């Protein structure tokens, strides 16, 4: 996974907040990320983000 990609997911985690699914993988598109399901994987494993029910939150 490519840092600055990480970095791109990072600042719109931090803008939006709380992102349905499909939404979050358009938008992280149309941001310049290819692959956006690697991107996402990575900032929950990092604790950034954490997944709901289709759904993906910031975390405090």
């Known amino acids: ?10 600042e719109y985690f931090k803008n ?18 290819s692959n956006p399901q690697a991107v996402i994987s990575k900032l929950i494993e990092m604790g950034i983000i954490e997944k709901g029910e289709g759904c993906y939150n910031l975390v405090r």
């Open 1 to 10: 996974v490519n840092q600055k990609e990480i970095e791109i997911a990072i």
């Open 16 to 33: 939006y907040i709380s992102v349905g699914e499909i939404v979050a993988t358009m938008d992280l598109k149309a941001r310049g990320i």
